[PDB]
């Protein structure tokens, strides 16, 4: 009321900074850039440096680096040992006390990468919002991108916080992620969890929708504004073959967005459930029926036995801090059943 | 033109039908009906099957005390192997069920049905005048289904290795397969994972861009994408973008199906065991070695018999 | 193993090639391979499907 | 008593919406009942 709607007023330094930041340059710096480009940059470098030189001989008792003779698949950035528990492992913190070499040896670089990457993701989403605002468009892309942030937070931050320490978080690496995947299969029976089912359904349906939409649009073009492809022809085709076909373009292109986001959000909820060991592991009725009747046996029972084997044969080396030594007679075997 | 053949041909080939039939429909429809009927009936009620062929039946029918997540149609018994096992070659219906014939029946009818469906997808496209190769895009899931249900049993020499027609059975199949062969550490499965993830990414991103642009424009969305990431001026037209959308996942699934078929003949993934060795000959464990330990556990618990 | 795997992959790819080329050839012979004429759509000459 | 409310609106949803809703409820049911029974 006192003044006009912020038209000119005064050219404060903030206005000059804003004008410089939002210049139509080759790269849109924007306000979010001050948070995105630095952090994300380190989030990359910390990985690659992490993959190249530093070792995991003291945290996990493994060799994970090119310097030690590891392929691209094998190399990884290992999490800090379980003794470190939930320490953020600041380079200036008590654990490292400002010694960069020992900070690397203790495994703090994983925390560096994870934290800076999370803040980089936040900055990237803010950048999406900023550009959408600048071009006067609805920010549906940010809503879509919210899902991968949900998965990252649920897997790399919520999960280890729910467990003993950072040790059980995924380690950045192609083979390390495979180890983590088999680890969830062995202990938590992650495949059986309903939320993982509701996420995999979303992912596969998303791939299906992508393929079908590409093929349909590319195979109903008009000979050569107006839409290039014939919507009526495609609707007739898919309504006569499959039975149901889209009739509204906006609804179709919104469904293609709705599927993966829902799938990944539901998987993230499932991983949150696992973070507190709330795992859909067992069916009590089937277990008691198999116990009383040795003859009775289903695929579920075989999966449970396989999980027991995975745990028994992996815990020896995947969890060194436990100092587990299993006599050869104790390890499960199929023939001993 | 009132001849029985003429009117029947007009009815089948006509587009007036709610669901187009076509000549391919002639074999497509009955095959799928037989497959789904036998599948439903077997899932609902069926006796235990001797999957491993050593007189240790495995319950898989819903009515015999197991859940939806656990119920499955057990594959054919190991004793028969690749021999053709209809009803009439079986000694009796009860023995046929005990050995696990209905899985073989279902899989044969299903493969025929899916192939005929792929064909009709071209035939109708030819009728309407649209371009013909939507079937090519459909060849990916068909190829994967053929690899899972037919090619892998052929390679392993027995029909008991086919994927059980159930959820927990599918998980068991995947775990056992990872145990026998390093499916995870194989480049073609890596390409399949890349294809699936990229398909999800592209579907989400394309939906977001198009739905945001639809206000009352495509130039604005193109500029949005160009400014967001450093990349500029790609997929300038809808034709290239919508071709790329179809090309990525289809190639990914083609490659994963080919990887499965390749493993059917015992050509496993990468084997990085004892890859790193220190001086004077010791073994330094790497993530591949922990994966190997997990595989050891899976495989040793898989061998039910001595 | 090498022979079987390589030749299965090549046979499958050449089958996909048959599908593609046969479809394209039939469409070109029919005359609507370039695209729909945007004036005389065969679908428009059909009644609404209810 | 107050005057009639000006911003009174009515909710609508067509047959597609009903089919989507029913299919969602039934799919969630078939998925989760297996674990509810346990």
């Amino acid at each position: 009321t006192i003044a006009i709607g912020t038209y000119q007023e005064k050219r404060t330094w903030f206005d000059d900074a804003d004008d410089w930041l939002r210049q139509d340059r080759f790269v849109f710096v924007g306000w979010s850039g001050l948070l995105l480009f630095p952090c994300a940059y380190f989030a990359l470098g910390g990985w690659l440096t992490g993959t190249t030189f530093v070792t995991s001989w003291y945290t996990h008792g493994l060799a994970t680096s090119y310097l030690e003779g590891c392929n691209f698949l094998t190399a990884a950035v290992s999490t800090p040992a379980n003794s470190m528990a939930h320490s953020l492992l600041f380079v200036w913190g008590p654990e490292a006390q400002g010694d960069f070499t020992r900070w690397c040896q203790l495994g703090g670089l994983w925390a560096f990468v994870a934290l800076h990457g999370a803040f980089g993701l936040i900055g990237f989403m803010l950048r999406q919002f900023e550009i959408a605002r600048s071009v006067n468009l609805r920010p549906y892309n940010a809503i879509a991108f919210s899902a991968p942030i949900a998965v990252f937070v649920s897997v790399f931050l919520i999960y280890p916080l729910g467990q003993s320490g950072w040790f059980f978080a995924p380690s950045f690496g192609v083979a390390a992620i495979f180890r983590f995947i088999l680890f969830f299969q062995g202990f938590h029976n992650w495949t059986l969890n309903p939320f993982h089912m509701m996420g995999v359904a979303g992912v596969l349906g998303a791939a299906l929708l992508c393929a079908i939409h590409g093929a349909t649009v590319e195979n109903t073009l008009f000979e050569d504004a107006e839409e290039t492809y014939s919507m009526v022809t495609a609707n007739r085709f898919w309504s006569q073959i499959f039975g149901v076909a889209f009739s509204n373009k906006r609804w179709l292109h919104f469904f293609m967005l709705l599927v993966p986001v829902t799938g990944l959000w539901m998987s993230a909820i499932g991983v949150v459930g696992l973070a507190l060991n709330l795992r859909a592991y067992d069916f009590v009725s089937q277990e008691i029926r198999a116990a009383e009747d040795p003859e009775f046996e289903t695929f579920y029972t075989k999966n449970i036995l396989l999980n027991e084997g995975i745990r028994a044969w992996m815990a020896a080396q995947d969890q060194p801090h436990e100092r587990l030594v299993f006599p050869e007679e104790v390890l499960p075997r199929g023939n001993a059943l | 033109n009132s001849s029985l053949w003429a009117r029947f041909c007009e009815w089948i080939t006509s587009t007036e039908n709610r669901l187009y039939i076509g000549w391919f429909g002639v074999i497509m429809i009955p095959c799928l009906l037989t497959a789904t009927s036998v599948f439903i009936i077997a899932f609902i009620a069926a006796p235990p099957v001797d999957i491993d062929g050593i007189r240790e039946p495995v319950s898989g029918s819903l009515l015999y005390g197991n859940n939806i997540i656990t119920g499955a149609v057990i594959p054919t018994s190991n004793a028969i192997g690749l021999h053709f096992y209809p009803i009439w070659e079986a000694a009796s219906l009860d023995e046929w069920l005990y050995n696990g014939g209905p899985y073989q029946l279902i899989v044969c009818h299903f493969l025929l049905g899916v192939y005929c469906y792929m064909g009709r997808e071209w035939e109708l496209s030819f009728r309407l005048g649209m371009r013909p190769w939507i079937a090519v895009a459909y060849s990916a899931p068909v190829a994967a289904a053929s690899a899972v249900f037919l090619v892998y049993p052929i390679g392993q020499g027995s029909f008991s290795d086919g994927m059980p027609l159930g959820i927990s059975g599918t998980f068991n199949f995947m775990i056992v397969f990872q145990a026998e062969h390093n499916i995870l550490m194989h480049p073609f499965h890596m390409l399949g994972v890349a294809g699936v993830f990229g398909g999800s990414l592209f579907s989400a991103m394309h939906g977001s861009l198009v739905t945001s642009s639809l206000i009352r424009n495509i130039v604005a969305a193109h500029g949005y994408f160009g400014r967001l990431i450093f990349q500029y001026a790609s997929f300038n037209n809808s034709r290239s973008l919508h071709f790329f959308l179809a090309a990525w996942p289809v190639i990914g699934i083609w490659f994963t199906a080919l990887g499965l078929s390749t493993m059917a003949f015992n050509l496993n993934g990468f084997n990085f065991n004892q890859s790193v060795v220190d001086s004077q000959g010791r073994v330094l464990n790497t993530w591949a070695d922990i994966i190997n330990r997990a595989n050891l556990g899976m495989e040793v618990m898989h061998e039910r018999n001595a | 193993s090498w022979l079987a795997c390589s030749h299965f992959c090549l046979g499958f790819f050449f089958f996909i090639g048959h599908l593609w080329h046969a479809g394209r050839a039939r469409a070109a012979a029919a005359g609507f391979e370039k695209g729909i004429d945007r004036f005389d759509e065969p679908v428009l000459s059909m009644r609404p499907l209810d | 008593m107050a005057r009639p409310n000006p911003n009174k609106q009515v909710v609508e949803l067509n047959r597609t919406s009903l089919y989507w809703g029913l299919l969602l409820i039934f799919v969630l049911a078939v998925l989760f009942s297996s674990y509810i029974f346990n």
């Binding site: - | 819903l62 859940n67 | 609404p48 | 067509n14 299919l23 039934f26 049911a29 078939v30 009942s33 297996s34």
Partner: peptide
């Protein structure tokens, strides 16, 4: 009796599919 519950859920779902196929609403 859980079997009857599972079967009811399955056949109900198939019924929804059938109605969505054959009883479509003509748009607008």
């Amino acid at each position: 009796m859980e079997a009857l519950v599972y079967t009811f859920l399955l056949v109900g779902t198939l019924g929804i599919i059938f109605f969505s196929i054959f009883f479509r609403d003509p748009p607008r």
